[PDB]
């Protein structure tokens, strides 16, 4: 049992959009363990119309956030993730350490979040525009039944529009890594 | 009984049924801005009767703003005294000094985390 | 470790060629490639050996673009490749190609296909930064019935004015990657 | 055996050899601008004759440039039906609609890749 | 089977930021993971003094910790920045940065020795992003007899204006890496 | 003995004793600037008497800045030494040409990098 992830060119499996109904993201995640840390690797797809129009603008923002059980099972029902993890064969050995980024209930620790940058790439001429991606590790909890967290934040920011029609929303591959929680 | 009470820090979690069966039970989750301390109650469940139990919203607080040490030379004091988002800080100069840009910053919401309206001012030496 | 690592070598011989038109091995790539769990963790930096090539950087802007290609089997067709040396352990090579299903092979090249980065170029005089954009195409593109798998690094500089004045040995910082294995 | 056959889209992979002989395969990858698609033949063979096998170069396609949807109000026809590299885009705005910028789009061959030298016009409401 | 070589999770005061220091001033978090003939690398730093949470009040400033090592693959705390020696998560040679991969050099100091990035700072007041240049240098340069293997850690600010206006505790992103490792 | 003895290129390592044994050795480190070449001593001992052995700091070296190709249609000849920070170097422009911009280019230490305080000049064919 060394990974952890959504599979394989997934089904629609999350919502992007406030209040729909309907799984409008496909969430690229896997994670991998190694050593005391995890590797990650996490690519994002646009499904439906409203999300493949948000790069119309001059700039957008996309926050998914997955929370766990302490067992380290998906919370379906809180999540924007609406589809549980799955190994490639507890689920605590992947989470993201307590003790390295706490919940806290005063700040929210800078100490907490991975900061980078993946690429969308245009529709007509394929060029290159910069997502801003952060992952934001624990810190924040919206339930009693939370005992870990991880949040992806995906944000445009540019001069001028991307596109000016519709079009499949995708963001580069975005690979990072954090301390992980070992069971214990 | 019906739909289940609405909050200001919590909302429901799934889809709101238009009948709840007796015994039936509820779940909150704090809404964008809040977060949860235990371990308070975030669920409600149908009575004996059909009006569902007592629940509130105070297992979600206020998002936090960052701390903000006093300036150089300077004091920086909460004049709402909260650092949740809403309220404001203020800002004072020593004796023999003077303040540059804004002696009020505001801590507003904006999306899922509490920030500052503006840059800490800075107290110059006359 | 069970056949865990798949690579180049440490410090190699000019192992490839950059230049459109030419034979001799004009560069010297270092690609590592490393099983772990359904991913592979990828190390790729480039040093230029030819003088044509060591006077790309004279120009506001270049491009360098080699494609590896593979058999069935997880081989490097020497032959197709801008690599004109096979890969081998440090100790089949399919565990380490990228997934068909991941990455698939197409009839027209997914954005989902693609790696996007940015590494550095050292300059010869006074050792500032100049950001190289890094690409990494996986499959996608196939140009002979013998490939099964593939992977393409393109190097591209682009700057206000050019890094170097005369020749000097190219070498792009070493950039990291991951994706998702066969199996 | 003598020289291989050439082709517009494939080129031979390797040294071309004066004299082949007999049963030994030469194969061939498509030229710069072309991309493969199974399942055709991208090899041939010397036959028990002195001549080459039958072979093509169909194997090999033409780049294309992405899928451009009709702009809102509008409509995106290709003016010479192609998405094939070197032919164009034109677009035509629907009644009581007009066109801002470019109702022409080349699909030039960048490297490599073929795109579209420039961004989709829009379709305005007058 | 010994796979993690580290600094561990939420350290004290680990080492000397500020130049002819008298106590440890910065807090720094390392992780060094074996992975086939690579190492992965997970780093970021954190500000312990009053002097070192004052260095973004400027436009630009710099910090450099740098590693020495034994010929075991021991920290040598006399020599290093980092004063407290590197632990497993249960020699650390096989951990060390690669000798034929990273040389020493006594003329040329090889461009392939860098390791070079971007890792980000949060200010203080709005939670905003400021970039921070990372190098790393592997071996290359020896100052002592002793020295057998060095990684040398870089952070660089820059930026057209200053970050703070008052001290606040600088964090460093965590920036991840990974490198030709040498092998017993 | 005591106080080891003070150098120009490396320092000592570790607090310094005021009062050190026979046979007790003392490490040194070359400075900031400096860099260490094998296999000369970086160390002394105490003798059967109670002075230091023998010891330079000749194992340590300055900084050298990193090699520059004669400018095409030029030359590039040092002034002093081997690239080693504090010395420069100069540009001579061949027959027919003519020199654009700094014949002279300082190799400056800047941390603990020694690097040229310019970029190299071009020599223009008239
Ligand atoms: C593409 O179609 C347009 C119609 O306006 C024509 O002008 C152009 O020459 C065509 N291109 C080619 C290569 O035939």
């Given at each position: 049992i060394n990974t952890l992830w959504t599979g394989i060119k997934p089904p629609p499996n999350c919502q992007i959009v406030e209040n729909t109904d309907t799984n409008d993201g496909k969430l690229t995640l896997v994670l991998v363990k190694n050593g005391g840390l995890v590797n990650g690797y996490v690519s994002l797809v646009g499904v439906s119309d409203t999300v493949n129009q948000m790069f119309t603008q001059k700039s957008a923002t996309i926050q998914l956030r997955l929370?766990?059980?302490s067992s380290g099972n998906l919370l379906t029902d809180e999540s924007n993730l609406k589809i549980p993890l799955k190994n490639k064969s507890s689920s605590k050995?992947?989470?993201?350490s307590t003790t390295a980024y706490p919940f806290n209930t005063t700040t929210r620790d800078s100490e907490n979040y991975i900061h980078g940058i993946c690429y969308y790439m245009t529709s007509y001429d394929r060029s290159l525009v910069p997502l801003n991606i952060s992952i934001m590790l624990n810190s924040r909890?919206?339930?009693?039944?939370?005992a870990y967290a991880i949040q992806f934040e995906w944000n445009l920011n540019?001069?001028?529009?991307?596109?000016?029609?519709?079009?499949?929303?995708?963001?580069?591959?975005?690979?990072?890594?954090?301390?992980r929680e070992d069971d214990n | 009984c019906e739909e289940p009470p609405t909050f200001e820090a919590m909302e429901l979690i799934g889809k709101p049924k238009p009948y709840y069966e007796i015994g039936e039970?509820?779940?909150?989750?704090?809404?964008?801005?809040?977060?949860?301390?235990?371990?308070?109650?975030?669920?409600?469940?149908?009575?004996?009767?059909?009006?569902?139990?007592?629940?509130?919203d105070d297992a979600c607080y206020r998002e936090t703003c960052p701390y903000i040490r006093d300036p150089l030379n300077g004091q920086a004091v909460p004049a709402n005294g909260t650092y949740e988002?809403?309220?404001?800080?203020?800002?004072?100069?020593?004796?023999?000094?003077?303040?540059?840009?804004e002696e009020i910053?505001?801590?507003?919401?904006?999306?899922?985390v509490?920030?500052?309206?503006?840059?800490?001012?800075?107290?110059?030496?006359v």
């Open positions: 929370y766990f059980d050995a992947f989470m993201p909890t919206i339930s009693s039944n939370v540019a001069k001028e529009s991307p596109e000016s029609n519709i079009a499949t929303l995708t963001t580069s591959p975005f690979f990072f890594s954090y301390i | 039970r509820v779940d909150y989750k704090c809404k964008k801005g809040y977060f949860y301390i235990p371990p308070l109650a975030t669920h409600t469940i149908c009575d004996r009767n059909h009006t569902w139990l007592p629940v509130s988002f809403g309220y404001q800080m203020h800002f004072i100069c020593n004796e023999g000094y003077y303040l540059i840009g910053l505001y801590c507003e919401l904006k999306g899922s509490a920030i500052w309206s503006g840059k800490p001012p800075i107290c110059e030496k």
